[PDB]
Please model this.
Amino acid sequence: NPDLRIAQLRFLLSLPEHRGDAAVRDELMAAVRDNNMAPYYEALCKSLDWQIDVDLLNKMKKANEDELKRLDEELEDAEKNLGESEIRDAMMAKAEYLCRIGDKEGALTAFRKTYDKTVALGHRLDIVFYLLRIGLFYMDNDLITRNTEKAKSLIEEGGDWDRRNRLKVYQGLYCVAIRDFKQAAELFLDTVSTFTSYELMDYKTFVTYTVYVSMIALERPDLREKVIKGAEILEVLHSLPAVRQYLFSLYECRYSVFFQSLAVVEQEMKKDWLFAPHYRYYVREMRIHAYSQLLESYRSLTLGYMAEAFGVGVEFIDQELSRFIAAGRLHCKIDKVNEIVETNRPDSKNWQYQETIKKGDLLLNRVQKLSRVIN
Amino acid sequence: MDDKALLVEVQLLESKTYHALSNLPKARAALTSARTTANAIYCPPKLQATLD
Amino acid sequence: VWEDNWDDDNVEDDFSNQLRAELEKH
Amino acid sequence: YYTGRLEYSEARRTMTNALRKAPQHTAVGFKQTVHKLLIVVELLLGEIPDRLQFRQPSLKRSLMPYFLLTQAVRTGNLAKFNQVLDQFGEKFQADIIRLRHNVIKTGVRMISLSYSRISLSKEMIDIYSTREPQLAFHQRISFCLDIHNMSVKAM
Amino acid sequence: KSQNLRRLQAQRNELNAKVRLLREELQLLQEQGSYVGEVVRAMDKKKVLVKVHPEGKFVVDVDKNIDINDVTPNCRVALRNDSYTLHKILPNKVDPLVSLMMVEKVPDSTYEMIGGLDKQIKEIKEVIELPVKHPELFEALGIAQPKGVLLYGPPGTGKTLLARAVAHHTDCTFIRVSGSELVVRELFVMAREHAPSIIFMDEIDSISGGDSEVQRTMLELLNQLTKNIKVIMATNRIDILDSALLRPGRIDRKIEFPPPNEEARLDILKIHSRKMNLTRGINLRKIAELMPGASGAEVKGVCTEAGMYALRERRVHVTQEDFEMAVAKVMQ
Amino acid sequence: QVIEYMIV
Ligand SMILES: Nc1ncnc2c1ncn2[C@@H]1O[C@H](COP(=O)(O)OP(=O)(O)O)[C@@H](O)[C@H]1O
Model:
């Protein structure tokens, strides 16, 4: 099932000297030494990594022509007494095998080839999962979205809601990579997760991904109780105490350990390949949601009690909160006249206005990009 | 013997013993199991309503 | 991505600012 | 665009009129400096983060200095805008108070400690409104649709 | 100015054409309404032999722009507005079998979701698409023709669904003559027209000469017989039927359906459990634990009843125990 | 805005 943790390894190796060689190097070449697969694993090492030596590469290409050569005579064998289920499965030799080649033609032009001569929807969304899931490995967003609108074609009897949840996990795992943190948590949250022994779910990851994707967009009063007093996730983060003490350090206001808990997440931001403005934006919105949670209950916030939030003192809160009100996303202001921060709340009536100036402009601009002669 | 001839009632009673102190190793399992074996007999409303 | 981030100027993040924060206090 | 090559009131409407005709035109000269120069002038009026950095990967046309000065104003201090200016020095387009203007949009609070600190009729503060304040922006899109009629006069 | 003026001419002429056919539209609708009807097709100079809807016959003409050459029988379209002469063609309007397929809508599309039968599908695909899509090795192997398959098994478990599925992987057709309610020998013509076809039967003894009569009645025409039609008979027991069918080989294939064992019932209960939501983990084996004599249906029934037993508590996830009170309910 | 307030 291309491609597994080798996606994360392919990230971690090409990640800079934050992480290079030395024992992410062997587990990568445990697959490269395994699966005998030339057409990506030379394009893998091309990226500032490794060159010829050809030492693995010869019997790698040789077993590639062994399996690739022997699969062809089932495509030419499946006419004696072998129907379209067997030309089908011969194209599954070419399809699973030429999908773990990791080529975007060897898999991609085989799947539309097996989209012809095709039995019903034990296939039509079996492959469009299996095409979507390697599209995650190659992050080609057009392939993902076209597999969504090809994958909303489940009206079989398709009200197969242990296969909607496979697609719902795929939507959550993709929409966390395209900033849509609203769609990610609930989809994840209301899923439970199970996909052929959770092999793409790769759990020891999933419920964690939920409980540190939630507090971006899942609203702090509403379903955060459904996070906390929801008896489906609390017992499986019981074995995961780090994200647990990341979770109950917001609603319990013990923030001298919460910034500690968020500094952990900024060290396990390194792992996931949906990476860079996701963790910088993520720490930004954990940070801003943490400060806005504190000062909203008070009409006046003193310097000593805001210093009590960790123990950072003054200038951390001063420069940082001045950057936040420079962004204007809280309502506070660094009233150093007394060193007591004031907070009323102008509501979200203005939120819209400010939102829609930019929004409106962008929308018209798109049309302004089109509605000239170029049509 | 024949399944749950009276162990619907005994299983109800030991299901009453846990909730004095205990947790989920009974809570849903033995009670719902008593209900699964409680839709296959002539039920009086004493035993069936006590199971309700 | 494709929702405009800052990612500009700022020195090493809440891990290191956490580190010199608690170290500078203590 | 050549008319775009002082005033800042209409450099962005001539930026919309400018950034039209280049499917694949040149690699130096005509295609290159129109985009990056005009968005630099779009920071000479003072327009900051959210059209800048994710709009960069279309061109990527040698892409160092002008973007560096855009975040050098997006932060807004003279200390590292110095080394944007003097250490580069060849960036050209020679033709300071604007990155001063950014940080003092905040204030400490408002007055700033009896009219004195440094950082380095609608009683509301300017949120929104239901009168003259938001009306101006409103009649923006209406005007746009009216100007977009031109579409009906083309077949 | 003249070019723009001719653009204004295009606008004015367009609106003037709109008012043309609106004005002669309001005088136009004072004319007649064409009839409609199926036919038995023409023979001669013009010709039709129609049968119009209320009273079913006439012989009418055809207009110059109709090209009487393609208008084939049982393809209803007419226009003999008043004098009785054709104009054009309309939506074919679903021929005969389209009727007894959509009507007896009994046959439910099925494909490959058969719950753990592989010897059975190997043997039926051995004798239902090899004699259709590869006849070449039968006319060189010395085999005459395989035709006619008897599906004997318990009520449930393989009927109306295996013969459905391998009828439509092959895209053959699936004619069912189960029952004779509303309308033998005429069905053969339809099957012949379809070119390739599959005829299916009925199995009633309990859930004198019922349908073995028609069975042979079409094996008499089928034996000497425009060749890729394959009758299928499902019965509950092989011993209950006629001694005339006991004539090897009259039934070139006697496929056997057993009641499902442990793992095949975790396969069918795996699929019907793949119809709905469950939870983070089921481990479906304990339900299959008491599978003992089960039936195909006996699995779809308990999975729907487990869904309803999750529905009774207004709950949106089918837990473990709703299966246990489903299969512990249905033991009746 | 009564002067200011093309659509037809
Ligand atoms: N192996 C199986 N796979 C899928 N469905 C089955 C299986 N066995 C029985 N069924 C169920 O039986 C129903 C089809 O009825 P059928 O088996 O044709 O009746 P009969 O048992 O009288 O032949 C379907 O709803 C189907 O779910």
